[PDB]
Amino acid sequence: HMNLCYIDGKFLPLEEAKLPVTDLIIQRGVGVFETISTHSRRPLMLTPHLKRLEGSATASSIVMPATLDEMARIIREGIKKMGCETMVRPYITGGDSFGKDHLFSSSRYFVIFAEIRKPDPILYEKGVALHPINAERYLPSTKSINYMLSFTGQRDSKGAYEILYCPEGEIVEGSHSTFFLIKNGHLITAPTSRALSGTTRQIVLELARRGNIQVEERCPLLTELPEAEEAFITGTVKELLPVVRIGDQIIGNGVPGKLTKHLHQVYLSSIVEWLE
Amino acid sequence: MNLCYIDGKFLPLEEAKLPVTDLIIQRGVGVFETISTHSRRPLMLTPHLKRLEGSATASSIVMPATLDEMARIIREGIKKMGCETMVRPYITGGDSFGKDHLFSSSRYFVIFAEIRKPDPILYEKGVALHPINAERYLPSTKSINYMLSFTGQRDSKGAYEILYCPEGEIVEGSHSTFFLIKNGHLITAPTSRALSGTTRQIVLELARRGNIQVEERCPLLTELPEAEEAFITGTVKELLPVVRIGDQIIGNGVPGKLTKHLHQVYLSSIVEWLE
Numbered sequence: 001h002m003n004l005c006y007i008d009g010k011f012l013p014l015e016e017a018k019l020p021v022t023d024l025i026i027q028r029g030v031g032v033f034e035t036i037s038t039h040s041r042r043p044l045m046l047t048p049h050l051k052r053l054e055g056s057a058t059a060s061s062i063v064m065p066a067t068l069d070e071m072a073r074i075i076r077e078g079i080k081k082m083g084c085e086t087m088v089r090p091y092i093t094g095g096d097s098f099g100k101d102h103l104f105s106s107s108r109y110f111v112i113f114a115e116i117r118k119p120d121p122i123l124y125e126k127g128v129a130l131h132p133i134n135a136e137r138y139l140p141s142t143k144s145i146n147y148m149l150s151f152t153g154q155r156d157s158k159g160a161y162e163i164l165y166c167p168e169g170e171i172v173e174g175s176h177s178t179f180f181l182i183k184n185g186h187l188i189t190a191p192t193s194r195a196l197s198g199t200t201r202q203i204v205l206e207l208a209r210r211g212n213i214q215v216e217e218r219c220p221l222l223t224e225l226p227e228a229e230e231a232f233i234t235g236t237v238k239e240l241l242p243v244v245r246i247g248d249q250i251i252g253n254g255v256p257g258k259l260t261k262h263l264h265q266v267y268l269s270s271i272v273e274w275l276e
Numbered sequence: 277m278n279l280c281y282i283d284g285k286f287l288p289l290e291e292a293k294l295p296v297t298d299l300i301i302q303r304g305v306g307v308f309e310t311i312s313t314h315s316r317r318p319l320m321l322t323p324h325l326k327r328l329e330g331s332a333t334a335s336s337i338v339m340p341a342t343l344d345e346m347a348r349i350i351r352e353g354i355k356k357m358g359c360e361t362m363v364r365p366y367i368t369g370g371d372s373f374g375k376d377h378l379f380s381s382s383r384y385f386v387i388f389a390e391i392r393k394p395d396p397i398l399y400e401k402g403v404a405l406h407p408i409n410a411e412r413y414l415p416s417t418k419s420i421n422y423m424l425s426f427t428g429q430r431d432s433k434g435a436y437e438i439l440y441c442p443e444g445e446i447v448e449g450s451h452s453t454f455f456l457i458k459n460g461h462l463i464t465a466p467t468s469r470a471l472s473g474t475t476r477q478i479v480l481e482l483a484r485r486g487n488i489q490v491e492e493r494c495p496l497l498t499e500l501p502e503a504e505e506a507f508i509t510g511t512v513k514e515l516l517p518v519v520r521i522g523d524q525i526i527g528n529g530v531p532g533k534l535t536k537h538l539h540q541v542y543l544s545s546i547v548e549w550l551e
């Protein structure tokens with residue numbers, strides 16, 4: 001498919017869109033972004049995503065270069081020009097300078113629209129492996145562009161789907177995901193003081209309330225995994241994706257569990273409520 | 277006026293652009309070095325290009341050019357600039373992370389700017405650092421991620437630079453190696469915890485020649501009351517006295533004799549490492 005980039009008021013072919021090297025997103029990694037996905041060409045949790053983008057910008061001392069309503073209009077228009085199920089990434093850059101006022105005042109912005117690349121049906125059927133590392137994301141409420149550790153943390157990884165941030169053996173979150181453990185039919189997930197306040201996570205907590213599943217907002221430990229029945233990771237593209245192995249440790253029987261499959265079926269049935 | 281070498285041409289900096297497909301933009305996958313000139317000659321060029329390769333290799337990035345071609349481009353840009361120059365070669369991840377867990381289509385570019393040395397008055401009176409409870413991830417790699425060097429200054433008094441003090445252990449500055457001076461010894465974080473700076477390496481060599489003991493450990497924020505001096509190093513700032521860290525005044529609160537001594541020896545001895 002011909003992916004798009006919105007930049008300087010125009011929807012360009014992605015492959016032609018360029019950014020000035022003066023921009024401190026290139027020189028110094030000053031940028032924030034979100035990933036927004038479509039179900040039936042409708043963006044899922046667009047407002048909650050645009051609010052998290054602004055909070056990422058504000059937390060990084062970046063003055064918003066457009067209103068949330070303008071970002072929303074561009075996202076909607078580009079989904080329509082794609083004509084397909086879309087992964088949408090709005091990026092807010094630092095721009096050319098950090099002022100004497102300790103603010104990035106000349107921020108740039110662009111929005112990448114790509115055809116959605118959902119996990120293959122077979123990864124929902126068999127589930128995935130995660131590679132644990134002794135590291136965490138600094139300022140976890142802020143989605144910056146720095147995903148260097150999502151990559152370098154692989155390579156001694158054994159074909160793992162994603163890395164899992166396990167600082168001092170405390171499971172916090174995946175490189176692109178909320179992590180859920182299931183122990184004696186309870187959901188266990190890191191509190192928002194340690195993990196990004198995921199849109200999927202918030203929808204999962206609501207489905208747990210509707211289903212009468214207790215949720216403990218604490219960090220599961222790597223040393224608890226032998227006693228777990230199931231595990232899964234969440235995000236707007238991956239939905240609920242079973243996790244059957246973490247490092248060398250198989251999760252219960254090593255195929256997706258009943259409560260993971262149940263919650264994924266409820267998530268898909270219920271999703272219309274959070275589409276815009 | 278500033279130049280960027282990109283795609284085989286020296287462009288004015290303000291005209292150079294990079295495709296947004298490049299993972300330096302989307303995912304922070306990039307490494308760089310800062311090289312400075314004394315007398316129109318690059319300082320520690322080969323050691324800098326070796327550290328750039330080491331940063332690339334550590335980030336699973338395949339070099340898009342030989343060190344000899346990078347050296348030739350750096351020299352040519354210095355000649356066009358016609359002033360003392362700060363040179364920054366950038367290695368990007370490019371468009372893809374392959375099946376092979378490697379960035380194989382890396383781009384590169386080289387920014388040439390007039391050197392912006394700290395004003396004489398900052399060496400005379402020395403500077404303040406703002407300590408924060410955090411450090412740089414993968415510290416031996418010089419990645420493009422400096423986001424914490426900016427966000428940390430919001431509540432900073434007008435301190436010159438932030439200082440990474442995770443759990444009260446002093447590691448390094450946002451743009452500098454940190455040195456503490458206690459009972460006439462140099463104390464600086466080991467290279468498992470701080471960038472292997474070219475200025476750091478030159479200072480350790482001057483310390484060996486001067487018979488000054490070096491302890492390669494993290495100094496603690498507690499210990500600053502008993503310290504005599506402190507200073508930060510980098511290829512542009514050279515040796516810059518540090519007279520205050522947060523609420524703690526250092527020794528006499530004015531630049532110390534061993535800091536001024538090492539700065540004079542650094543400037544006298546620099547000719548050895550010019551290329």
Ligand SMILES: Cc1ncc(COP(=O)(O)O)c(/C=N/OCCC(=O)O)c1O
Nearest residue numbers: 035176177178198199200235236237238
């Ligand atoms: C560090 C981190 N944690 C958690 C999440 C999950 O947050 P939501 O998606 O639930 O809002 C993300 C999102 N990545 O976005 C990638 C989406 C995906 O690829 O599945 C993330 O980057």
Ligand SMILES: Cc1ncc(COP(=O)(O)O)c(/C=N/OCCC(=O)O)c1O
Nearest residue numbers: 450451452453473474475510511512513
């Ligand atoms: C985070 C950090 N630590 C330490 C260093 C010190 O390394 P060298 O420079 O001695 O190789 C630097 C380099 N910037 O150098 C910037 C030039 C300056 O402003 O001093 C750096 O960015």
